[PDB]
Amino acid sequence: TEWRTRAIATSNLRTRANNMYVAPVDNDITYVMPKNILKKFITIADLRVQVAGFLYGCSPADNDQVKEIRCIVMVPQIGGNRSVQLPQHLPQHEMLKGLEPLGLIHTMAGNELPYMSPADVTTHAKLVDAHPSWKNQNTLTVTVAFTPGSVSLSAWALTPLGYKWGVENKDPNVDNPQGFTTTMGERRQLLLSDKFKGFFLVPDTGKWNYSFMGSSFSGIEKKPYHVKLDTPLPFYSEQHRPIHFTSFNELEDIWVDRADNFA
Amino acid sequence: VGGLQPKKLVNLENLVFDQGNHLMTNPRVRMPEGTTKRVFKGYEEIHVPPPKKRSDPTDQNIPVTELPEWARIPFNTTKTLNKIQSKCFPTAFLDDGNMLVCAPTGSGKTNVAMLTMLREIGKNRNEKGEIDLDAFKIVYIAPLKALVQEQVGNFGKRLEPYGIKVSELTGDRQLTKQQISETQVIVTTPEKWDVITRKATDISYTNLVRLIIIDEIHLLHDDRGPVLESIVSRTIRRTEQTGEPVRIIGLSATLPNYRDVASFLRVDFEKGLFYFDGSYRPCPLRQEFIGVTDKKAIKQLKTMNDITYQKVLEHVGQNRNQMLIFVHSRKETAKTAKYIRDKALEMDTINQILKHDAGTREVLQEAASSVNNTDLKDLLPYGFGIHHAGMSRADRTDVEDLFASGHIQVLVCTATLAWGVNLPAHTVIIKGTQVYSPEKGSWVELSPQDVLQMLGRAGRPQYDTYGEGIIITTQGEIPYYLSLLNQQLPIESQLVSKLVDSLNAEIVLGNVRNRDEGVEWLGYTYLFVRMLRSPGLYSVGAEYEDDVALEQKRVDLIHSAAMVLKKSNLIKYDEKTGKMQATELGRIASHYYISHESMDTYNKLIHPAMNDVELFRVFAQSGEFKYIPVRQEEKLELAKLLARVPIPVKESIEEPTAKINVLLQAYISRLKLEGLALMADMVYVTQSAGRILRAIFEICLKKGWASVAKLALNMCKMAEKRMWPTMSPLRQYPTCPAEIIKKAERMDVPWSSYFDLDPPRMGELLGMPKAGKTVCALVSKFPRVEIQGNVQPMTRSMLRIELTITPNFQWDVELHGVTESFWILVEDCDGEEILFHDVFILRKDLAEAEENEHTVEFTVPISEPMPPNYFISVISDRWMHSETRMPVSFQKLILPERFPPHTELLDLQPLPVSALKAKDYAALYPNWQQFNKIQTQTFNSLYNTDNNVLVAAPTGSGKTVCAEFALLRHWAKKDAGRAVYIAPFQELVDLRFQDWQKRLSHLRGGKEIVKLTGETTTDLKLLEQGDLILATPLQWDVLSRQWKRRKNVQTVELFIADDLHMLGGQMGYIYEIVVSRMHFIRTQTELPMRIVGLSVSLANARDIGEWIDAKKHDIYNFSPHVRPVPLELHIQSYTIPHFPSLMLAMAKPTYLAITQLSPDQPAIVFVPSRKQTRATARDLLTACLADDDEDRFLHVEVDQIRKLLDHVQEEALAEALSHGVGYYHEALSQSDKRIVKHLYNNGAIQVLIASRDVCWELDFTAHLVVVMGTQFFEGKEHRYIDYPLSEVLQMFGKALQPSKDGRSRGVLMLPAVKREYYKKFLNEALPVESHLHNFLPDAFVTEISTKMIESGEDAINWATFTYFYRRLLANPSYYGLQDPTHDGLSQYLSDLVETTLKQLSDARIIEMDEDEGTVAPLNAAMIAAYYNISYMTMEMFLLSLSHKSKLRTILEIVTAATEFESIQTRRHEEGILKRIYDHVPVNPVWDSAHFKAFVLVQAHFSRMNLPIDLAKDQEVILQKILSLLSAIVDILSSEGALNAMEMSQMVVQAMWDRDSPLKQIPNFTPEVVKVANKYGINDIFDFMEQMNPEENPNYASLVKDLGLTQAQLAQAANFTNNKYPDITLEFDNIRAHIERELEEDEEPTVHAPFYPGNWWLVVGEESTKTLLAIVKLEFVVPSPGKHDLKLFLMSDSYVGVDQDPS
């Protein structure tokens, strides 16, 4: 009852991607993202639950203060209403060579907070802390908020105090964790381009949505997973919910006679 | 009768026959005399007494011995035929006319059809050569599968002695056409045969059908009728239009309008049509028609039950007989039987008590009830029975036998038993006449064909004289069945229903291109004849009384039908012109049998961004399910069902759409369905999904939508194999238990972890010790493809890619058949669009072979802002979860440098000829004042500066005069230095030679322009003999190899290189080599030398110009559209996966294209194969025959040309030229060629059809040049390689004859996915890269010999002067260079040279690599250098030889040569080939040229008569002698040896090993040598002594009379005294010349009528295993012992006469 209406709702996500909205910023480093992988990303997501993907890219030769998001890696994840359960291993592949980790991208069911949320601050921080390769070249968290018929993009970098609090947020997971502040994340200028195409990276098995496979997620989250260059599968794809397609045991024969004639 | 314009538009829906199958067009129901009617409470009864015909008036049966001995076999069981077959016999066996027999069911009608087959066997049988199994096909069409299977059974067993194999057309196996080509007397259903012919994939075999039998042809009345009409119509359509005889036989039931059906089959009434009334029925039939009068439903059903009950008492109690009752439902057969038993228990022990008498009721009923597994056998022991398709084979067979035994008194069964086996249970009852049809989605009345077959199965023929058929329906339906069981129900046509789709199918096959063609096609239907005899009944309109042949009516019909086809975008239709042309959408609709409305919704709803749920939605919106309603009686069941299906359908709620969607899902997921109407509708959706999904599949495919197409394909596999894509693939294995499948689907394991493993390690992987052994076999047989792709940036705009597909599984005919189909998909980075796709077949032969590496070449577009990667996927077409995907990264790819704009053509003065400063040179072209514009822009550097110049203009631009302006200037100066011109092929060198030789014989300066032949002995000084020479890149390679020590090789100031772009064409590397050195030549001598190069418009001329060293000022590259005569190009994309079927398909369009663009102008048609020239010419003439103007392309009466009757050596060309066509191919004789060129240019013939292999040799030109096909079959790799761009340019270069428009026109017919490849490089210049790096060793092995490659580092320098080096920097990735920088480039050269030279190290050629791995040319490489033998062949020449030469093995060694592998290999010439092996002595690959060369040489040995195409025999002869003369030079070393010199002796004179030498003399047939043997004429010496005047006892009286030859015997005597030479060469210690002459005053190479186109080698001595020793010889020798023996003689090629005197 819950998921079925959500699956049919995914169909109108493509109309959402066509009309996007990027939040401007009055500040005093620029990031560019190829529309192709972003539109495909929005279409792949769910209407109610968060979907995430690691960011990789590099700075062009002409401009070293600009970094292009060359790839979006899909990892085995269990979506949440306000959070996302990510693994503690990075994707290794030949396609990522010459590229650098640039945070992660995820969508938001409810409307966006004009500040870096405690969830994004905690996940981004602990991802920066746990992974050595993650902290050096500055990374950011990109949120793709959903508004009926539109999409709002925001880019938040992690502040020093935000990092110290995020990792140290041992626990309170909530909308107002003890110690949280609206000034733990500063926004970054994000831009969209149709000049170049970015590529994708999904798990070699092909399955990244372990929501309908939560029992199987625990047996891979703390292990190194292979990644292959391919196209990402939809959230409610058949592979993500193979249990739904499992055959019952109702009568397999057919008590109605009719000739096909077409052999 | 031609009338084009229509006057009234009509609505087809308004004319369609509602009540179709149940149509009753008779207002009168004639009834038998004894007909009576009784009335009862609730129902009526009409009894009809049976006719009697025991007294057959004036006829009996014909004896089986009447037939010939070869046709009396299959009638084994019967000692004589039947009178039903007796009257038909004379026409059925002794005439080839169409037939139509109307006889009662079970009267032995099949025997009549067998005569028609046996007669066709007679046309294919002779006293000798009988049992011809590959020259005829027979088609038997049955309405149902149960019939085709039984007819396959008896025909197969009865025709067994004939060795002919019967089969039923079905499934994908024969969808892959294997069984249609291998089996004869093919049996199938109407739909399957129609869809098979619609696809036209097997058109090559469909032309072999001489006979077609239509059983149950009265099915025309049913909705399936239009299928029979669509078949018979098109058949007779061409059968009487083209002339090709096709016989049609009709097997129908006794019904009205049989005369109309007769005229429909074009049958002669007097001898063709026969009618047998019910009196000819096996057993007389008494008919009961019971009509229930109850109004309400429930009361009717109960009434029927009671009536069936009471009838059971009267037909088993009153008169004890078996009782077959038919019902229309599985679950009903049990209820009806149970009701009869249960309700019978009014203590009515009767029949129950009466059947109990024997010990049977105590046993068999009890004994049989326990053995079987079928439940509901609670009523079996009561003498009741049940028979439906749901029954197991064991149970149904038991019931059938028990009933035949008589142990079953009452058998209730469905229609399955009515069409399956034969029971005739005496009395038959049909309880109710209502059935549910999911199609119409309602409760329609029973089908008449079902009724006839039911009641037709009446009383026992031999046991009963009484046939009692009882039919229980409703009172309102009585008159219908009375009209059916009494020959009253007329057979009408339902064509109006499927008229639109039938016309669509006819337009797709090309059988209908015009509206008049549609009217013509409609004239051969059954609807047409019924409209003729019954204008009012079919409502013609009465407006067509003045319409003679109902043409205007047919025009209005075809118009409206084409209109709806036009508005649906199925066909492209012009209203007023009348012409039509089917589109790609219409093709799919025809190939899968789908309505136009359904196709319309698909084309308007399917978009690239669709998912799974939406695709299911579009599926449910099909027009085939628009009648299926959602009844409230089942809504509660669907709701709970809709909320548990895999794919959410919640978008639709309680609509017919949601029902159809949930049904298809339910069937796949196996859900619960209880409603009878529900289960019926689900089955209908299931049996339609298979074709619906594939239709959407090809729609997504042709629109290039990757994601959607892949989803559609998975759905196809879903419905076909019945499973979800995530289910266990083991379901696709019939021989697989359900237990392991059930266990597998509960395993959290991917399908990827099943492969490459042993049974043990898999047993615990799936948790079953038992399946460990079997599962490993199943997975191993699963189609697994491992691919490896290599990319080559052909252009900065387009990408060329080479795909290598290698099978990774084991074959099983049960699961794979003979061929496995695949799909090659290439997606972009997004994977949203398809950049390329094409079907990939995989035959069992190539797959099983040790070397199974399959390769396929194709191209794909590229955006300069190149995306990260592409996607190449190879997917199975029928197997699910059998995909092989490969990411094609581009981060390594480096695009070639951009191309500068072509040298724009400036508009200056025309520059008249007088500007040359001479009037004598004006004789060049006297007719026209100013010459071609191209040279008016290049002349100022052409005949001025003596530096290099390169011109690049399109073919036929007025191109060759460029070099002329280079020679005219060069030969107008003092001390005219010698010159040399080089064309790519011999065809071109002697073509422009024949022009410049005779047209330019003027010696004023230039004189004696000679043509290089090849032999170095004559050309070495013929170059010094003449002022200029024309040669090929090959003979200019062997010659001038050493440049330092030659006389005239330096003085060449002017060197011409025509068609330099062909350097990239195969064997063009030899062109690149010679051109590369020549530039290096003029550098060392410091002398000034010009090298002009002529070629087509090139993409980049910067590298070629620098290759010749010419600055930008004098380098001209024009756009490929500055051609003087504008080329109007027309491309036609064709979508057919069969090469042959594609050629016949293009036959029509080519005939049209010629008549559209060149009605008064000449036209040429290029064809892939030499053989295809004869066929295409034949298909073209037949096309003219169909339009009724066969001599369309003949513009003069045959009498003016008939003088060239037998002057044409080839018969096919004579018949073709007889109607105004004619062709041209390489196997054509020069004589025939002269006749063609004369008859073409003189305007006798209008169209020519040349081969592709003759594109260069062809001196012809025309207004329209069509390119039929762009692929040729290469037997080397067993593929269909695409045309080289160079060819298409040359072939269109023949279209230089402009029209009144002033613009030439050409058409290019190619496969669909090859369009944007040819259309691109035809709009822009031609790009070409060298292929030297592939064939380096060939270039090296020759270069090593010329003392220029002793260092190998000079090879580094040598490469620099090659076009290969210049391009490697500009386009690195193309060749394999991964590092653009210099150090990386030199690194690549170092690796390659040390790799290829290493290849020459592994094979017998110098090796050492110390103080430089430097190498001097070895013996093998040396001889290979002068004769240009491939090292691949020479590596084959060194390995095979053994301790003993063994002779005849060397001939195998000769045929193992690689030079023969490049031979044309037409597929179906294997039969005759193997036959020649049966007529010749002596593990060869059959399809290989190796075996073909071996056999053809065998033929040359016996001088066997070979077919025209086997001129390949001549090809092998031409080059082998020079190659074999090297084979002996190679075998000079080691021991023996020189047997090949005897072998060369064999081939030169066409002789055997050591047969009579008289075979060499003119004539002298093998019988004449017998006449020579009986007399003293053994060898020729005694022949000449037995021929001369005074001797041979003066003809031994007369010997010349004993010899067959009389006159012209001097030609034989001439060879003996004059041609056959005489010896003149004459024969010094224990240890430490003269001249040929005879007679006198003699000037005479060799007598060679057998062969198309030396004095050195001698040998000596022998001991034990023998050795060798090849103005005397200096033969200095160190030896142990002493000896003296023989020396040999010359004779490089002469039969016998080989002295070995010591």
PDB file of N, CA and C in Angstrom, chain A residues 170-217:
ATOM      1  N   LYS A 170      28.296  11.691  18.898  1.00  0.00           N
ATOM      2  CA  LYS A 170      28.163  10.262  19.169  1.00  0.00           C
ATOM      3  C   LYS A 170      26.722   9.808  19.002  1.00  0.00           C
ATOM      4  N   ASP A 171      25.787  10.599  19.519  1.00  0.00           N
ATOM      5  CA  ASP A 171      24.369  10.294  19.366  1.00  0.00           C
ATOM      6  C   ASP A 171      23.436  11.403  19.823  1.00  0.00           C
ATOM      7  N   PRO A 172      22.464  11.780  18.978  1.00  0.00           N
ATOM      8  CA  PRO A 172      21.183  12.226  19.497  1.00  0.00           C
ATOM      9  C   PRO A 172      20.122  12.185  18.387  1.00  0.00           C
ATOM     10  N   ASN A 173      20.485  11.563  17.261  1.00  0.00           N
ATOM     11  CA  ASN A 173      19.834  11.709  15.948  1.00  0.00           C
ATOM     12  C   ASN A 173      18.391  12.204  15.969  1.00  0.00           C
ATOM     13  N   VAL A 174      18.229  13.446  15.529  1.00  0.00           N
ATOM     14  CA  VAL A 174      17.040  14.228  15.807  1.00  0.00           C
ATOM     15  C   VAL A 174      17.056  15.455  14.905  1.00  0.00           C
ATOM     16  N   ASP A 175      16.068  16.328  15.044  1.00  0.00           N
ATOM     17  CA  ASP A 175      16.023  17.533  14.231  1.00  0.00           C
ATOM     18  C   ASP A 175      16.806  18.661  14.897  1.00  0.00           C
ATOM     19  N   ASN A 176      17.186  18.443  16.151  1.00  0.00           N
ATOM     20  CA  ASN A 176      17.946  19.430  16.906  1.00  0.00           C
ATOM     21  C   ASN A 176      18.900  18.780  17.903  1.00  0.00           C
ATOM     22  N   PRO A 177      19.899  18.044  17.393  1.00  0.00           N
ATOM     23  CA  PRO A 177      20.875  17.348  18.239  1.00  0.00           C
ATOM     24  C   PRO A 177      21.567  18.280  19.229  1.00  0.00           C
ATOM     25  N   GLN A 178      21.844  17.777  20.426  1.00  0.00           N
ATOM     26  CA  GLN A 178      22.438  18.598  21.472  1.00  0.00           C
ATOM     27  C   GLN A 178      23.810  19.111  21.053  1.00  0.00           C
ATOM     28  N   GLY A 179      23.862  20.381  20.667  1.00  0.00           N
ATOM     29  CA  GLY A 179      25.106  21.010  20.269  1.00  0.00           C
ATOM     30  C   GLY A 179      25.056  21.575  18.864  1.00  0.00           C
ATOM     31  N   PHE A 180      24.026  21.199  18.116  1.00  0.00           N
ATOM     32  CA  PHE A 180      23.887  21.631  16.731  1.00  0.00           C
ATOM     33  C   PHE A 180      23.686  23.139  16.618  1.00  0.00           C
ATOM     34  N   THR A 181      24.143  23.704  15.505  1.00  0.00           N
ATOM     35  CA  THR A 181      23.973  25.124  15.228  1.00  0.00           C
ATOM     36  C   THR A 181      23.792  25.347  13.731  1.00  0.00           C
ATOM     37  N   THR A 182      23.045  26.384  13.372  1.00  0.00           N
ATOM     38  CA  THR A 182      22.747  26.663  11.971  1.00  0.00           C
ATOM     39  C   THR A 182      23.972  27.159  11.209  1.00  0.00           C
ATOM     40  N   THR A 183      25.023  27.508  11.940  1.00  0.00           N
ATOM     41  CA  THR A 183      26.229  28.054  11.328  1.00  0.00           C
ATOM     42  C   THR A 183      27.357  27.031  11.264  1.00  0.00           C
ATOM     43  N   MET A 184      27.003  25.765  11.074  1.00  0.00           N
ATOM     44  CA  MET A 184      28.005  24.708  10.995  1.00  0.00           C
ATOM     45  C   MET A 184      28.357  24.372   9.552  1.00  0.00           C
ATOM     46  N   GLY A 185      27.683  25.023   8.613  1.00  0.00           N
ATOM     47  CA  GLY A 185      27.939  24.793   7.205  1.00  0.00           C
ATOM     48  C   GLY A 185      27.725  26.034   6.363  1.00  0.00           C
ATOM     49  N   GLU A 186      28.711  26.359   5.533  1.00  0.00           N
ATOM     50  CA  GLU A 186      28.602  27.495   4.629  1.00  0.00           C
ATOM     51  C   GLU A 186      28.313  27.019   3.212  1.00  0.00           C
ATOM     52  N   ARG A 187      27.513  27.791   2.487  1.00  0.00           N
ATOM     53  CA  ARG A 187      27.092  27.411   1.145  1.00  0.00           C
ATOM     54  C   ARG A 187      28.192  27.677   0.123  1.00  0.00           C
ATOM     55  N   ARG A 188      28.167  26.925  -0.973  1.00  0.00           N
ATOM     56  CA  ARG A 188      29.165  27.064  -2.025  1.00  0.00           C
ATOM     57  C   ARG A 188      28.486  27.261  -3.376  1.00  0.00           C
ATOM     58  N   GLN A 189      29.093  28.075  -4.234  1.00  0.00           N
ATOM     59  CA  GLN A 189      28.526  28.350  -5.548  1.00  0.00           C
ATOM     60  C   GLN A 189      28.520  27.103  -6.424  1.00  0.00           C
ATOM     61  N   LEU A 190      27.327  26.667  -6.812  1.00  0.00           N
ATOM     62  CA  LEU A 190      27.178  25.506  -7.679  1.00  0.00           C
ATOM     63  C   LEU A 190      26.626  25.927  -9.034  1.00  0.00           C
ATOM     64  N   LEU A 191      27.110  25.294 -10.096  1.00  0.00           N
ATOM     65  CA  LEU A 191      26.691  25.657 -11.443  1.00  0.00           C
ATOM     66  C   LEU A 191      26.386  24.424 -12.285  1.00  0.00           C
ATOM     67  N   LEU A 192      25.449  24.569 -13.218  1.00  0.00           N
ATOM     68  CA  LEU A 192      25.072  23.476 -14.105  1.00  0.00           C
ATOM     69  C   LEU A 192      25.547  23.751 -15.528  1.00  0.00           C
ATOM     70  N   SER A 193      26.012  22.710 -16.210  1.00  0.00           N
ATOM     71  CA  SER A 193      26.561  22.869 -17.551  1.00  0.00           C
ATOM     72  C   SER A 193      26.108  21.767 -18.505  1.00  0.00           C
ATOM     73  N   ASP A 194      25.934  22.132 -19.771  1.00  0.00           N
ATOM     74  CA  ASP A 194      25.593  21.175 -20.817  1.00  0.00           C
ATOM     75  C   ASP A 194      26.758  21.016 -21.785  1.00  0.00           C
ATOM     76  N   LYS A 195      27.932  21.470 -21.362  1.00  0.00           N
ATOM     77  CA  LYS A 195      29.112  21.455 -22.216  1.00  0.00           C
ATOM     78  C   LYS A 195      29.770  20.080 -22.247  1.00  0.00           C
ATOM     79  N   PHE A 196      29.806  19.417 -21.097  1.00  0.00           N
ATOM     80  CA  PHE A 196      30.430  18.104 -20.995  1.00  0.00           C
ATOM     81  C   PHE A 196      29.524  17.114 -20.273  1.00  0.00           C
ATOM     82  N   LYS A 197      29.711  15.829 -20.557  1.00  0.00           N
ATOM     83  CA  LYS A 197      28.919  14.783 -19.922  1.00  0.00           C
ATOM     84  C   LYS A 197      29.706  14.063 -18.835  1.00  0.00           C
ATOM     85  N   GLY A 198      29.101  13.929 -17.661  1.00  0.00           N
ATOM     86  CA  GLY A 198      29.689  13.149 -16.590  1.00  0.00           C
ATOM     87  C   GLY A 198      29.279  11.696 -16.730  1.00  0.00           C
ATOM     88  N   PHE A 199      29.990  10.804 -16.050  1.00  0.00           N
ATOM     89  CA  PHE A 199      29.677   9.381 -16.126  1.00  0.00           C
ATOM     90  C   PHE A 199      29.210   8.850 -14.777  1.00  0.00           C
ATOM     91  N   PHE A 200      28.795   7.588 -14.756  1.00  0.00           N
ATOM     92  CA  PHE A 200      28.293   6.967 -13.537  1.00  0.00           C
ATOM     93  C   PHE A 200      29.174   5.813 -13.074  1.00  0.00           C
ATOM     94  N   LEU A 201      28.936   5.361 -11.848  1.00  0.00           N
ATOM     95  CA  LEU A 201      29.633   4.208 -11.293  1.00  0.00           C
ATOM     96  C   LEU A 201      28.745   3.488 -10.289  1.00  0.00           C
ATOM     97  N   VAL A 202      28.331   2.276 -10.639  1.00  0.00           N
ATOM     98  CA  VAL A 202      27.477   1.480  -9.771  1.00  0.00           C
ATOM     99  C   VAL A 202      28.197   0.216  -9.321  1.00  0.00           C
ATOM    100  N   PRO A 203      27.674  -0.439  -8.274  1.00  0.00           N
ATOM    101  CA  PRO A 203      28.249  -1.694  -7.781  1.00  0.00           C
ATOM    102  C   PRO A 203      28.232  -2.772  -8.855  1.00  0.00           C
ATOM    103  N   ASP A 204      29.254  -3.622  -8.868  1.00  0.00           N
ATOM    104  CA  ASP A 204      29.398  -4.639  -9.905  1.00  0.00           C
ATOM    105  C   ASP A 204      28.193  -5.571  -9.940  1.00  0.00           C
ATOM    106  N   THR A 205      27.571  -5.772  -8.785  1.00  0.00           N
ATOM    107  CA  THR A 205      26.379  -6.604  -8.699  1.00  0.00           C
ATOM    108  C   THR A 205      25.198  -5.905  -9.361  1.00  0.00           C
ATOM    109  N   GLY A 206      25.229  -4.576  -9.360  1.00  0.00           N
ATOM    110  CA  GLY A 206      24.183  -3.788  -9.984  1.00  0.00           C
ATOM    111  C   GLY A 206      23.162  -3.259  -8.996  1.00  0.00           C
ATOM    112  N   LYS A 207      23.126  -3.855  -7.808  1.00  0.00           N
ATOM    113  CA  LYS A 207      22.157  -3.469  -6.788  1.00  0.00           C
ATOM    114  C   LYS A 207      22.755  -2.493  -5.782  1.00  0.00           C
ATOM    115  N   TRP A 208      22.122  -1.333  -5.640  1.00  0.00           N
ATOM    116  CA  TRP A 208      22.580  -0.322  -4.695  1.00  0.00           C
ATOM    117  C   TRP A 208      21.497   0.028  -3.681  1.00  0.00           C
ATOM    118  N   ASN A 209      20.245  -0.245  -4.037  1.00  0.00           N
ATOM    119  CA  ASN A 209      19.123   0.016  -3.144  1.00  0.00           C
ATOM    120  C   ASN A 209      18.777  -1.205  -2.299  1.00  0.00           C
ATOM    121  N   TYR A 210      19.389  -1.299  -1.123  1.00  0.00           N
ATOM    122  CA  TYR A 210      19.153  -2.427  -0.233  1.00  0.00           C
ATOM    123  C   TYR A 210      18.076  -2.123   0.801  1.00  0.00           C
ATOM    124  N   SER A 211      17.052  -1.384   0.387  1.00  0.00           N
ATOM    125  CA  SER A 211      15.923  -1.102   1.264  1.00  0.00           C
ATOM    126  C   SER A 211      15.032  -2.333   1.371  1.00  0.00           C
ATOM    127  N   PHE A 212      14.689  -2.909   0.223  1.00  0.00           N
ATOM    128  CA  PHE A 212      13.908  -4.138   0.189  1.00  0.00           C
ATOM    129  C   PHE A 212      14.799  -5.344   0.460  1.00  0.00           C
ATOM    130  N   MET A 213      16.081  -5.083   0.689  1.00  0.00           N
ATOM    131  CA  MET A 213      17.047  -6.141   0.954  1.00  0.00           C
ATOM    132  C   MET A 213      17.872  -5.816   2.193  1.00  0.00           C
ATOM    133  N   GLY A 214      17.221  -5.221   3.187  1.00  0.00           N
ATOM    134  CA  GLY A 214      17.887  -4.794   4.406  1.00  0.00           C
ATOM    135  C   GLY A 214      18.633  -5.907   5.115  1.00  0.00           C
ATOM    136  N   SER A 215      18.140  -7.131   4.966  1.00  0.00           N
ATOM    137  CA  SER A 215      18.778  -8.286   5.582  1.00  0.00           C
ATOM    138  C   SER A 215      20.100  -8.609   4.897  1.00  0.00           C
ATOM    139  N   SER A 216      20.241  -8.162   3.654  1.00  0.00           N
ATOM    140  CA  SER A 216      21.437  -8.440   2.868  1.00  0.00           C
ATOM    141  C   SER A 216      22.446  -7.298   2.944  1.00  0.00           C
ATOM    142  N   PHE A 217      21.979  -6.130   3.373  1.00  0.00           N
ATOM    143  CA  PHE A 217      22.821  -4.941   3.435  1.00  0.00           C
ATOM    144  C   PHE A 217      23.919  -5.066   4.485  1.00  0.00           C
TER     145      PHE A 217
END
